[PDB]
C-alpha cells in the first residue's frame, strides 16, 4: 500500500490475474494517476489476449494441456521400463491408518470421507504400494510402476493448492543399486519429459515420510521423493526395499506455461488450457 | 446334455479366467464339476502367464490407451478436450431433475450438504459448452473422459467408479441426429468395435436415449436436443451428445469376462488378476 513507489493494488492484481497470464506485481509508478492509467491498459491487454486465446483454441482444438503433459511423462516412463497402473479413487479407512494418517494427524483433517469406512484418496502411495507388492510375487526382477490421477484434499485455499489435483506417483520396488542415484535419474526423466529440465533438490520435513527430497523451481515445490518407509506393510515383518516420487502435474504445467494462478491448467468449469471461458 | 456351470462356479471361473464359461453344457453334475476343476486350473495358469508377460514388456495401461485412441480420433474431428471437476453441486444435479424425491437420488455419493461426486458428465459439459458458445458462432464440439461415481448393485457390467467419455456438439451443421450417428461411428471405430447397434431406450433423466449396444450390452447412451433439460442450462439450440462407458468398451473388445478387469483396480491389471 505504498504511496511513494506505487504498485498495482491487491485488487488490481487479482483482476489482472483473472484473465491475464503476465507478471504484474513488479510494476512501479510515480503516482496513483500513473498506476491507474497503466492498469487500464494492462487490463485491456489481458482481457483481449484471453479472448484471442479461447477463440483460437475453439477453432483449433488440441488434446487438453494436462492430458498431453500426462502422456509425455507416461511415454517417457514406459520407455524406462515402468508399468502404468490405474487404481481406485476410493480407499479404506484401514489403508489411511496404515500410513499413520490417523485421527491425530494434520493430513487427517484434510480427508474427504465417503462413508464410515472409505474416503477419497489424498495420495497415491497406499494403492501403489499394494499393487507393487503383489506384482513382486510374479517376478524376480525389480518392479517399476507409476500412476497419474486425481487425489483430493481439504485445503486452506492458498497459493498453489486445489481441492482436487492430479498427482503423478512413480515407484520402484525390489533389488537396489545406489538407490538415490537411481531415484534422481527418474526425477530427471520426468522433469525433462515435462519440459522443465532446470530444478533444485531441497530436503524438506514431512510428517508422513519423516524426511523427503523435494523438487523446487524458484522455491515452489512440485514433487516429493523418498526412499520408502515400511509402516504401510504392517502385515509383514520383512519388507521389500522401494522408493518413489510424487509430482504435482497442475503445478508443473502452471510453471511451464507461466499461468498466473494454479486454477487455470487442470480440471475446471471456469478455465480451459490457461484461458478463462466466462 | 443340459447341465451348466452354476453361478458360483461361473464367478470362480471368471475371477482368473477370461474364457466364455456360460456356454458349456454337461451330461450330469459329475461331468460339470470335473470340467470346472480343469477349467479353473487352466484359467489360473493362463492368468499367471499373462501377468508375467506384462512385467516383461511394460506398457501404457489398457484403459489409458483406449482413452488416447478415442481422444485422438475426436481431436481429429475438431473436438475440444476439456477436463472438469469431479465435484458438482446439489443444484447442478437438480437441474438434471435428480432431486430428493426421485429414486435416482439415492445412487449419488455425497461429499457435503451441497456437493456430490458427479454420477455423469452432462452437468459440467452443459456448463462448458454453453460458455464456449459465447465465443463462437460455429458448432461447439467438446468431450471429456473422467471418473464418475454411482452407488450400484452387483458388478453386472457395473462399477462404483467408472470412466465415462462424453462428447457433445452444440449447434451442429446438419441434422443433430445424423451428426450424432457419425460421431458415435468415429468413437466406436477408434475403439476397435466397428460392429454395434443403435437402439432407442428409456431414461429417467432424459426420458429417451439412443443407446449403443453390442450383443445387447449397453455401452453408450446418447441424446439429441432441443431437449426439456436445456432450459435449466440456458441452452436454446439443437445439440447432440453421447456418453460412453470406457471400461465396458474395453471389456467387450478384449473379451474380458467381467467389467472389473480392464479399469482402475488393486486386484486386476489389464485383464489379469495380480493377487
Ligand atoms: N492441494 C494440492 N494442489 C495441487 N497440487 C498439490 C496439492 N497437494 C499436493 N500437490 C502436489 O502433489 C505433490 C505431493 O506431495 P505432498 O507431500 O503430499 O504435498 P505437500 O507436501 O503437502 N505440498 P504443499 O502442500 O504445497 O506443501 C506435491 O509435491 C505437489 O506438487
Ligand atoms: N456403474 C457403471 N459402471 C460402468 N459403466 C457404467 C456404469 N454406469 C454407466 N456406465 C456407462 O456409462 C454410459 C453412460 O451412462 P448412463 O447411460 O447414464 O448409464 P446407464 O443408463 O444407467 N447404464 P445401465 O446401468 O447398464 O442401465 C452407459 O452407457 C454405460 O456404458
Ligand atoms: O504421501 C505423499 O506424501 C505423496 C507423495 C509421495 C512420496 C513418496 C513416494 C510416493 C509414491 F510411491 F506413491 F510414488 C508418493 C503420495 O503418497 O502420493
Ligand atoms: O453423462 C450423462 O449425463 C449421460 C450421457 C450423455 C447423454 C447426452 C449428452 C451428454 C453430454 F452432454 F455430456 F455430452 C452425455 C449419461 O448417460 O449419464
Ligand atoms: Mg499440503
Ligand atoms: Mg511434500
Ligand atoms: Mg444404471
Ligand atoms: Mg440404461
Ligand atoms: Mg444409459
Residue numbers in the entry:
A (entry chain B): -2 to 275
B (entry chain A): 1 to 275
From the study:
Here we report that pyrrolysyl-tRNA synthetase (PylRS) and certain PylRS variants accept α-hydroxy, α-thio and N-formyl-l-α-amino acids, as well as α-carboxy acid monomers that are precursors to polyketide natural products. Here we report that the tolerance of MmPylRS for substrates with multiple alternative substituents in place of the α-amine extends to Methanomethylophilus alvus PylRS (MaPylRS)38,39 as well as MaPylRS variants (N166A V168L, MaFRS1 and N166A V168K, MaFRS2) that recognize diverse l-phenylalanine derivatives. We expressed and purified an MaPylRS variant containing these mutations (MaFRSA with N166A and V168A) and demonstrated using RNAse A and intact tRNA analysis that it shows high activity for derivatives of malonic acid 14 carrying m-CH3 (17), m-CF3 (18) and m-Br substituents and low activity for l-Phe. In vivo studies using traditional and engineered E. coli strains confirmed that MaFRSA supports the biosynthesis of model proteins containing internal, aromatic, α-hydroxy acid monomers. This work describes the first aaRSs that accept α-thio acids and α-carboxy acids that could support carbon–carbon bond formation within the ribosome.
To better understand how 2-BMA substrates are accommodated by the MaFRSA active site, we solved the crystal structure of MaFRSA bound to both m-CF3-2-BMA and the non-hydrolysable ATP analogue adenosine 5′-(β,γ-imido)triphosphate (AMP-PNP). The structure was refined at 1.8 Å resolution with clear substrate density for m-CF3-2-BMA visible in the electron density map. MaFRSA crystallized with two protein chains in the asymmetric unit and an overall architecture resembling previously published PylRS structures. The two protein chains in the asymmetric unit are not identical and interact with different orientations of m-CF3-2-BMA. In chain A, the pro-S carboxylate accepts a hydrogen bond from the backbone amides of Leu121 and Ala122 and the phenolic -OH of Tyr206. A hydrogen bond from the Arg150 guanidinium positions the pro-R carboxylate for nucleophilic attack with a distance of 2.7 Å between the carboxy oxygen and the α-phosphorus of AMP-PNP. In chain B, the orientation of m-CF3-2-BMA is flipped relative to the conformation bound to chain A. The pro-R carboxylate accepts a hydrogen bond from the backbone amides of Leu121 and Ala122 and the phenolic -OH of Tyr206, as seen for the pro-S carboxylate in chain A. However, in chain B, the pro-S carboxylate is rotated away from AMP-PNP and towards Tyr206, resulting in loss of the hydrogen bond to Arg150 and a longer distance of 3.9 Å between the carboxy oxygen and the α-phosphorus of AMP-PNP. The two alternative poses of m-CF3-2-BMA in chains A and B correspond to a rotation of ~120° about the Cα–Cβ bond of the substrate that largely maintains interactions with the m-CF3-2-BMA side chain but alters the placement of the reacting carboxylate.
